[PDB]
Structure 1
Amino acid sequence: VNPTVFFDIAVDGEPLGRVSFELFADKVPKTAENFRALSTGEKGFGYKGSCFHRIIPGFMCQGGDFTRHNGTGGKSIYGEKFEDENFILKHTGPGILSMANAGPNTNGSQFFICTAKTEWLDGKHVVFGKVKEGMNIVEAMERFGSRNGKTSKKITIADCGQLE
């Protein structure tokens, strides 16, 4: 019943591979639906063509700023921001998909894929999904990151949509 979304990742335009996520719509329906709709583009805007602007190896990959491509933009399907839905799910290890924000109830479209357990984010960032296939592609993305988050090559979502 939970939707599955995929990204096809390209590096400087060259295909890298596919990542698919399980979204936990049973527990965070409003948050999951935002990510799902941005992945299909069915509302007229979304992630297709956007980049991962921050990648910290051993920490996380952050993306989803499809308006300014640098961590200062993005928007949700509900408006410029929306509330923290709940904090049922925790940051338990690599592959967790969680919402970036700028304080309480400031979710937009930016998200991060954790590549390590990040328990200090529990109760501060809404967890809403998990990598289902292609964790190895996420690990390959990590090798283009750096300590300060700048990427050595442009990492883009070349295509994205819903599988189930």
Structure 2
Amino acid sequence: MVNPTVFFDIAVDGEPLGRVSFELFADKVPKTAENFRALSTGEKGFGYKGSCFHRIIPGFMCQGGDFTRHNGTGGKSIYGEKFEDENFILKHTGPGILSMANAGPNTNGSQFFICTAKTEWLDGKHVVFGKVKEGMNIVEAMERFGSRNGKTSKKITIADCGQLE
């Protein structure tokens, strides 16, 4: 089994920006990778297409995945509202890391963040499960629409997403 790859096509106020692609570490965190993969294809009937990156903080991270409340208070996994922390084998080593948002132990849903800096104080508390493969330049472009309090100055949306061969 090769680790799956997913893409997001990013838009800024509805205008196309570019594609970010991710490797999902199914070899290390299969359950968590699977969740993100299936939310990216929409195959369960729900997922990331059309949702936004609601919180973006330059020099920190871009957060999204909340496709039920659009603001950081919602989202759901493919396993139920929330699922356990699978493991913490992988660390927040630098820009490009893909990690699950949470509000406490064992509260993973659909929300995730893309690191734009090393965030090592999250090791052992947020489950890392993939990394940007292509389009880190697109993530950098995204990040310029954030702000210190994480409110975005333009709407950053996942116009399309899915799995690459």
Shorter-chain TM-score: what band? over 0.9
Structure 2 distance, partners of 1:81, 1:143, is 31
Deviation at residue 107 of structure 1 after TM alignment: 0.2
How many residues align structurally?
164
Q: Secondary structure at the match of 1:52?
A: coil
Deviation at residue 61 of structure 1 after TM alignment: 0.1
Moved beyond 2 Å, runs of 4+? none
Deviation at residue 34 of structure 1 after TM alignment: 0.2
Which residue pairs with 1:118 in the alignment? 119
Any gaps of 5 or more consecutive residues in structure 1?
Answer: none
Deviation at residue 35 of structure 1 after TM alignment: 0.1
Structure 1 distance, partners of 2:105, 2:161, is 29
Cα deviations across residues 73-115 of structure 1 (Å, max 9, x unaligned)?
A: 0000000000000000000000000000000000000000000
Cα deviations across residues 47-90 of structure 1 (Å, max 9, x unaligned)?
A: 00000000000000000000000000000000000000000000
Cα deviations across residues 13-50 of structure 1 (Å, max 9, x unaligned)?
A: 00000000000000000000000000000010000000
Structure 1 distance, partners of 2:125, 2:102, is 9
Which residue pairs with 2:38 in the alignment? 37
Structure 2 distance, partners of 1:42, 1:99, is 20
Any gaps of 5 or more consecutive residues in structure 2?
Answer: none
Which residue pairs with 2:160 in the alignment? 159
Which residue pairs with 2:83 in the alignment? 82
Structure 1 distance, partners of 2:28, 2:96, is 18
Q: Secondary structure at the match of 2:141?
A: helix
Structure 2 distance, partners of 1:106, 1:142, is 26
Q: Secondary structure at the match of 2:40?
A: helix
Structure 2 distance, partners of 1:50, 1:125, is 22
Question: Identity across aligned pairs (percent)?
Answer: 100
Deviation at residue 142 of structure 1 after TM alignment: 0.6
Q: Secondary structure at the match of 2:129?
A: strand
Structure 1 distance, partners of 2:110, 2:47, is 8
Deviation at residue 125 of structure 1 after TM alignment: 0.1
Cα deviations across residues 112-163 of structure 1 (Å, max 9, x unaligned)?
A: 0000000000000000000000000000001000000000000000000000
Q: Provide TM-score, normalisation by structure 1.
A: 1.00
Structure 2 distance, partners of 1:117, 1:146, is 18
